[PDB]
């Protein structure tokens, strides 16, 4: 298998993780372990592994869970996948748009509270001086 | 066995081998989900259950558009001769494998050119030919390793085509396994122990 | 087994924990105990041990649990592992980026509260003096 | 016996032997997950059950690349 033959079969990330070479797959002797399993397609196996991993990681570490669901939904063999992915992209675009639209008000409130807490310093120091 | 068809996945030994293994498990899927895989596996299991032999060959054919593919074909075990010196199952200490093939005329023209003489038959009208393909394990003298060489030949005609190390590693394409090897070096199968019950029935 | 033969088979941490020598594995007589078990692959056994350990350590000491899940997920034989690990790295990078971005405001609030509580000292002392 | 194939894991006697044992359990996996292991064990059990003998030999072959 040549390098362009490999990159026509596998994804870009799977190709880029192995080739950091000399344009050839060079496995060593003590590198691979052969494990038998049932013959299933790769996206279905990845979907089942994603499902059990999200059902395992839910009580022990919840904040890791909502960052995994686009990576879970990218590995779905459903025909609705191309709609769900652009729905996720539109929701993330709307969320970051609202965040960057409301951020000047937040930094204004932050600076104004800082100025209020400094005004309390100079007020109490002037009262102590007088 | 049809619904419990087993595939082999690869796991990393070290932590750095994972980017290799998750690559290769993605590259074995075009070997898994081809059309010939399930046919060859079910033919293999039928040959292992009825008789004792299971023979599966692999090929590295590359058609026209730089597309290397691993073909898989289950071989009929009656047209397959193993070296008589190999005693164990899986036939690992075997020095030669012979397969006796029927070959049509134009497939024999595509298999090797018209410069060498072919001993055809005349069975009805079509000029078929009986060709024995032998795979021999011989160690080289430049390197000190064993390589497998292919000889397409006919009885009482000579050698049609002789190639040495035709796989870039000297690997035999055949994978053989014998179920129930016994004394006198035969394969016993599931047929012989259930045959007298069928005869009495 | 030579040292480079050993380091081609085992991980870097497993090699570094044993060789602190003389470039050879030298086990003593009263060092090892042979225990029989079912023949299983090492990552599956480590995954089951990680699962039972995280189900044991959950009520008795919870703060140890979210620091173990990258070490648990590194020992997973799933094909989604290379995605989960970079998802963890991206989440940790984003978390430490937000923390180091919000930390000047936190230390500003700390210093300002310290100055307010000192201004109360000088105010009450000046009132007592007058 | 085919599905209950037994492997042997190593445990430390003292606390300092663990870095040895977890090393050696990682080095026995290339002896465990080789192709000849299950064949030799099932041939061993068949010879121990049909007859009385079970004979298994080991070798330390090193082919070409310091392996």
UniProtKB/Swiss-Prot annotation, chains A, C:
<protein>
    <recommendedName>
        <fullName>Portal protein</fullName>
    </recommendedName>
</protein>
<feature type="coiled-coil region">
    <location>
        <begin position="80"/>
        <end position="130"/>
    </location>
</feature>
<comment type="function">
    <text>Forms the portal vertex of the capsid. This portal plays critical roles in head assembly, genome packaging, neck/tail attachment, and genome ejection. The portal protein multimerizes as a single ring-shaped homododecamer arranged around a central channel.</text>
</comment>
<comment type="subunit">
    <text>Homododecamer.</text>
</comment>
From Swiss-Prot, chain D:
<comment type="subunit">
    <text>Homododecamer.</text>
</comment>
<protein>
    <recommendedName>
        <fullName>Portal protein</fullName>
    </recommendedName>
</protein>
<comment type="function">
    <text>Forms the portal vertex of the capsid. This portal plays critical roles in head assembly, genome packaging, neck/tail attachment, and genome ejection. The portal protein multimerizes as a single ring-shaped homododecamer arranged around a central channel.</text>
</comment>
